[PDB]
Amino acid sequence: GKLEARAALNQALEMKRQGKREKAQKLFMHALKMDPDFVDALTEFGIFSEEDKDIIQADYLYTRALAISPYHEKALVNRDRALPLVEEIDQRYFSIIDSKVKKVMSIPKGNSALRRVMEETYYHHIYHTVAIGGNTLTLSEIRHILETRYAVPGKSDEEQNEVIGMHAAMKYINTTLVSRIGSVTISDVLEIHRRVLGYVDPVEAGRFRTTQVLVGHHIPPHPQDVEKQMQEFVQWLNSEEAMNLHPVEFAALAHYKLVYIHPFIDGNGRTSRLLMNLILMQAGYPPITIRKEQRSDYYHVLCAANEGDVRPFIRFIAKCTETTLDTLLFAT
Amino acid sequence: GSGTVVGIDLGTTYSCVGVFKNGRVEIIANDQGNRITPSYVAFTPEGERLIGDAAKNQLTSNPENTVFDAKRLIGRTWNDPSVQQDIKFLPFKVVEKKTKPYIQVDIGGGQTKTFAPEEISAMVLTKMKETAEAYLGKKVTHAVVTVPAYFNDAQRQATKDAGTIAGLNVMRIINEPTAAAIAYGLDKREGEKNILVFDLGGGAFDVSLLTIDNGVFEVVATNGDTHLGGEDFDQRVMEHFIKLYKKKTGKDVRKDNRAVQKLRREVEKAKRALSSQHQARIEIESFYEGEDFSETLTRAKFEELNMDLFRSTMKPVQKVLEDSDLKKSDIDEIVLVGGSTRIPKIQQLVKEFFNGKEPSRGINPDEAVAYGAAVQAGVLSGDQDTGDLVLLDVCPLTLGIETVGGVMTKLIPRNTVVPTKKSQIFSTASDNQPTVTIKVYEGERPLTKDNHLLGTFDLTGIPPAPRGVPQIEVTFEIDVNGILRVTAEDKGTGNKNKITITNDQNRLTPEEIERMVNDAEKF
Ligand SMILES: Nc1ncnc2c1ncn2[C@@H]1O[C@H](COP(=O)(O)OP(=O)(O)NP(=O)(O)O)[C@@H](O)[C@H]1O
Ligand SMILES: *CC(=O)NCCc1cn([C@@H]2O[C@H](COP(*)(=O)O)[C@@H](O)[C@H]2O)nn1
Ligand SMILES: [Mg+2]
Ligand SMILES: [Mg+2]
C-alpha cells in the first residue's frame, strides 16, 4: 500500500541522520516497493545517492520523479546540480581509457606477445559476436571450421554459415576498409551485411528490407524511409561533429543508430558491432569485445537507449573497451 | 473507507481479536467474557451451528460433527503425508475433493454438507469479526490476520481466502514472530537491538531473529515447523494413557471417538496445570462402557513423553543464528510467545541454549501475536497514534526451479526481504515448441524430490520458431503478504506475442469462492 510507503520514507530519513546508511538504503528501497511513484522517496533517495557520490544513480532517480511530477522543485534543483557532475564522471572515465589505449599502442607491433594475443583474439571476436545471439559453436570448433575448412558433425549448418559469414566480413573490413583513407558509404554497409548473411541467407544478404518489421517495442523507420535514414546516417558518419566526439562515444552511437534504423531483416546486431570496431580501429583503438556473457546487459542498455537514455549504452561500450584493453595489457 | 481495521490471531487451537483505537491496543473479549476463543466449529443434531467456546464445550457429546485444527489442513493436498496421518487422529470425516482434503459433517435433519478447510477457518474469522463488531458497535470489513512465519505459498493464499469467505478484506497477513516483535517494541524506544522470538503454540512453531530499531522491524532469519505444537504434546500423552488403559482393562478405546475426545480434553487441562504443578490428576467418569478413568500425570512423565519434541525446537534457533551469521552473545533479548512456551521444560531448554540468559518477561505469550496484529492493523488504517511502523519481513522458504535431473536451482533464497522480484530467461527445447513448462519448488534441499512443490506453470502462446530462439522472461514476484505471483513476457525482437500462463495448483477459483461467500452470508 501507498500509506506504508510514507512511513518507510520517514524512517529512511531518520536512519540517514544517525549515519545508519545501510539501513536507510533498505528503507528507501522498501518505500519505493510500496509505491514506485513516491515522488518524495525518489527525490530523497537521489539525495542519498548523491551523498555517496553516485551521481549517475541520483540523476536517474531525479528524472524518474520528474516524469511523475515535472514541476517538483527539489528534484528540478538537484538534477541541475547533478548534470555537470555526470558529465565529469563520463569524461573522467574516458580519460582512463585514453591512458590505457595509448599504453597498449606504445609497444611495437612486431612483438610476439601482442601478435599472439591479437591472433587468438580474432577467433574470440567471431565466437562472442555469434554466441551472444544464440550460436552454440565453441571457440575450438569455430577455429576448426575456418582453419581446416572441414565441417563439424553434430553442429547445424546455419550456425556454421554464420561463423564463416562473419569470417568473410572481418577479413573484408581488416584488409579493405580499416586502412582506407576515404569516407564510409552505403555500399560499404551493404557489403558487410552481404558478407555477414551471405552463407546463411544469400537472398537477403547485401540489401535493405523492403517491408516494415518490428524490433520489440522499438519501431524502426518505414521501408520507404530506410534508405533516406541510412543516407543521413552515413552523413553523420565522416562528419566533423562525429570526429569531435570521443572515439568510444562515436563508435557506440554509430552502433546504436544502426540498430535503431534496423535496415536488414537479419544481421543488424552483427553488422553494427562490426561497424563499431571499424570506427575504433580507424581511431587507433583495438577492436573491443562484447562478451557472450553480457547478452542480458547488452539487451538492457539497448532497451534503455530505445526509451530515451543512450548514455548507459555508451558507458557499456566504454566498459567493454576498458575490459579488452586490460586483457591486452595483461600480456606484458 | 476501510472502517476500523482489527487484528485477528487465527491460531491452530485458539483465536484472538484486538484493535488499536484511541491511542492504545485492546484485546476484545467474546460474548462469554473470554479474551481468547478456541478455533472450534460444531453442528448440533438439532441444526444449530456453534463457533468458539460453545463448539468446544460440546465436543465430547458430539465428536463427529465438531471440527477443529483445520489450520493443519488448509493449503494442503489429499496426498500430503501430514494430512493422511492426521485423518486417523481427527474425529470428524475428511474426504477428498478436487485433490484437496474437505470436511464432511452432519448439520442435522440427516443432511450432510461438505466444507473446504478455508470455509471452516472462515467461520472462526466470522466469530472474531462479530466479536469486534459487538464491541465497536459497527461492521468490520478489513482486518490483519496472523499466519505462521513458515507458512508456504498455498497456506498463505488459503488463509486470505478464508478471510474473503468471512466477508473480510485481509489488508495484510502478518507472520506471528513479526507480530510478537511489534508487541514487544510498542513501549520501547532503545535504539538498535537484536531480538530472538520463540513462537511455540498449539499447532505451529516459529523462530525469528529480528533487528529492532525505534519502529523499524527487520527480520534477519526465520525457521520453524508448521506442524509442531501443543496438539502433538497432548497426543503423546493420549497415546500413553490409551496403551495404559488397554493394559489395565483389556479394552481398546481407540475406535471410540467419544472416549478419545474426553481424554484429549482432560490431557490438555492436565498439561496446563503441570506448568505450575508437578502432578495432575485425570478423572473421567463413564469413560468407556460405563467404566471410569482415573490416572495421575507427573510433570516428569509429561516431559518424558515429549522430550524428543522439546529438544527438536532448538534446531530452528541454531539455523537462524547460522543464517544470520550471529552468535549467542549478539542476541540482546529473548521473547517467548505462544501458549506452549509456558511449559517449564521449554523455558529451561531455551535458557540453557543461551547459557542461562533470562528471557524477556512482560508480554502475555498467549496474546502477544494478537497485540502486534492489532497494532499493524492500526498502522494500515492511518491511526494518529501508531507511528512510522515499518516491517522488513522475509520469505521463509527458498523458491527454486526443477531443472533437468531433479536439481533444485535457487531463484529466491530464503530470508529474502519481501516484496521482491526475480526474473530469468527461459527458452524452448524443440523446434516450433508452443508451450514451456516450469515447475516451482519450496525448500532448502539440493533435489526437488525432497522439497515441496509450489506449482507447475505452462507458458502457452509461443509462435513457431527453432529451438533456443524464443526468449521468454518469467518474473517471480513475492508480495508483501509473502504470496508468489508468476508472470511471463516475450523479450525477443519482432512482434511481441502474449504469453499466457496456466497452473495446476487447483486452488479455490474466484467462482468457487463466491459460492462459499454466499453460502456464508446465509447465516
Ligand atoms: N499453561 C500452559 N501450559 C502448557 N501449554 C499451554 C498452556 N496454555 C496454553 N497451552 C497450549 O498452547 C497452545 C495454544 O497457544 P497458541 O499460542 O494460541 O497456539 P495457536 O493458537 O494454535 N497458534 P499456532 O499454533 O501458531 O497456529 C495449545 O496447544 C495449549 O494447549
Ligand atoms: C526494451 C527493448 O527495447 N528491447 C529491444 C532491444 C533491441 C534489440 N535490438 C536488435 O535487434 C536485433 C534483432 O531484432 P529482431 O526484430 O529480429 C538484435 O541484433 C538485437 O540486438 N534492437 N533493440
Ligand atoms: Mg492463537
Ligand atoms: Mg506460533
* Distance (Å) from CA B30 to ligand 4 centroid: 22
- Return all residues near B432 (Cβ < 8 A) that are at least 6 apart: B464, B465, B466
The alpha carbons of chain B give a radius of gyration, in whole angstroms, of 24
Answer for the pair B122, B515: CB distance below 8 angstroms, yes or no.
Answer: no
* Cell 489442513 found at: B73
Residue nearest to atom 6 of ligand 2 (CA): A303
Give the start-end residues of each E strand in B443-522: 452-460, 472-478, 484-490, 500-503
Question: Within A52-185, where are the H helices?
Answer: 55-68, 73-104, 112-131, 139-148, 157-172
Cβ of A216 within 8 Å of Cβ of B493? The answer is yes
Q: How far is CA B214 from the centre of its chain?
A: 28
Nearest to B205 by CA among B355, B52, B72: B72
Cβ of A214 within 8 Å of Cβ of B480? The answer is no
Q: Which three cell numbers stand for residue A320?
A: 567493454
What domains are there in chain A, each with its CATH number? 2-92 (1.25.40.10), 93-330 (1.10.3290.10)
The amino acid sitting at B269 is: K
* Cell 515499518 found at: B390
Nearest to B477 by CA among B495, B497, B501: B501
Cα–Cα dist B410/B393, whole Å: 20
Cα–Cα dist A54/A47, whole Å: 10
Q: Most A CBs within 10 Å: which of B218, B376, B388, as the mutation test of the A interface?
A: B388
The amino acid sitting at A298 is: Y
A33 close contact with B: CB closer than 8 A = yes
CATH number at residue B269: 3.90.640.10
Q: Which three cell numbers stand for residue A152?
A: 563439424
Cα–Cα dist A92/B424, whole Å: 34
Residue A266 φ/ψ, nearest 5 degrees: -135, 165
Cα–Cα dist A214/B493, whole Å: 7
Answer for the pair B522, B123: CB distance below 8 angstroms, yes or no.
Answer: no
Q: Which residues on B lie below 8 Å from A200 (Cβ)?
A: none
Cα–Cα dist A187/A81, whole Å: 45
Provide DSSP, A306-330: TTT--HHHHHHHHHHHHHHHHHHHT
Q: Which three cell numbers stand for residue B14?
A: 485458539
* Cell 514541476 found at: A71
Q: Give the CB-side neighbour count of residue B448, counting CA atoms within 13 A.
A: 21
**Three-state SS at B384:** coil
A17 close contact with B: CB closer than 8 A = no
* Cell 574470440 found at: A124
Q: How far is CA B274 from the centre of its chain?
A: 26
Ligand with the closest atom to the CA of B271: 1
Provide DSSP, B155-183: HHHHHHHHHHHTT-EEEEEEEHHHHHHHH
B477 close contact with A: CB closer than 8 A = no
A193 is catalytic: no
Q: Which three cell numbers stand for residue B460?
A: 502457452
Q: What is the DSSP letter of A107?
A: S
Provide DSSP, B30-54: -TTS-SSEE-EEEE-TTS-EEETHH
Answer for the pair A10, A41: CB distance below 8 angstroms, yes or no.
Answer: no
Answer for the pair B487, B459: CB distance below 8 angstroms, yes or no.
Answer: no
Residue A275 φ/ψ, nearest 5 degrees: -65, -35
Q: Which residues on A lie below 8 Å from B469 (Cβ)?
A: 134
Cβ of A11 within 8 Å of Cβ of B388? The answer is yes
Cβ of B480 within 8 Å of Cβ of A34? The answer is yes
Answer for the pair B29, B35: CB distance below 8 angstroms, yes or no.
Answer: yes
Q: How was this structure determined?
A: X-ray
Cα–Cα dist B521/B523, whole Å: 5
- This PDB structure is determined at a resolution in Å of 2.6
Cα–Cα dist B333/B357, whole Å: 9
Cβ of A216 within 8 Å of Cβ of B496? The answer is yes
Beta bridge partners of B68: B40
Beta-carbon neighbour count of residue B186 at 10 Å? 18
C-alpha distances in Å from residue B146, one per residue of A278, A320, B59, B175: 63, 51, 26, 6
Q: How far is CA B22 from the centre of its chain?
A: 30
Helices A247-261/A268-282 angle, 10° precision = 160
Residues with CB under 6 A from ligand 1: B 11-14, 71, 148, 176, 201-204, 229-231, 268, 271-272, 275, 338-340, 342-343, 366
Cα–Cα dist A272/A254, whole Å: 8
Helices A268-282/A186-196 angle, 10° precision = 120
Answer for the pair B247, B295: CB distance below 8 angstroms, yes or no.
Answer: no
The nearest alpha carbon in chain A to B497 belongs to: A216
Nearest to B284 by CA among B300, B297, B275: B297
* Distance (Å) from CA B71 to ligand 4 centroid: 12
Q: What angle do CA A201, A206, A211 make, to 5 degrees?
A: 80
Beta-carbon neighbour count of residue B77 at 10 Å? 16
Residue nearest to atom 3 of ligand 1 (CA): B272
Atom of ligand 2 nearest to the CA of A262: 11
Residue B500 φ/ψ, nearest 5 degrees: -90, 140
Cα–Cα dist B202/B69, whole Å: 9
C-alpha distances in Å from residue A257, one per residue of A90, A248, B129, B138, B501: 20, 14, 62, 64, 36
Answer for the pair B282, B297: CB distance below 8 angstroms, yes or no.
Answer: yes
Query: Ligand 1: which of B8, B9, B10, B14 to mutate, most ligand atoms within 8 Å of CB?
Result: B14
Cα–Cα dist A314/A312, whole Å: 5
Nearest to B193 by CA among B201, B185, B203: B185
Cα–Cα dist B484/A296, whole Å: 24
**Three-state SS at A23:** helix
**Three-state SS at B361:** coil
The nearest alpha carbon in chain A to B420 belongs to: A33
B493 close contact with A: CB closer than 8 A = yes
| Among the partner residues A15, A23, A214, nearest to B494 by beta-carbon distance | A214
The alpha carbons of chain A give a radius of gyration, in whole angstroms, of 23
Taking only residues 270 to 299 of chain A, the set having a beta carbon closer than 8 angstroms to any beta carbon of chain B reads 296, 299
Cα–Cα dist B328/B317, whole Å: 10
* Cell 586483457 found at: A327
- Return all residues near B310 (Cβ < 8 A) that are at least 6 apart: B303, B343, B345, B346, B349
Helices and strands in chain A: count of H runs, count of E runs: 15, 0
Q: Quick one: CA dihedral A175, A176, A177, A183, positive or negative?
A: positive
Q: Which domain holds residue B276?
A: 230-303
C-alpha distances in Å from residue B414, one per residue of A283, B74, B478: 50, 22, 12
Q: Give the CB-side neighbour count of residue B487, counting CA atoms within 13 A.
A: 9
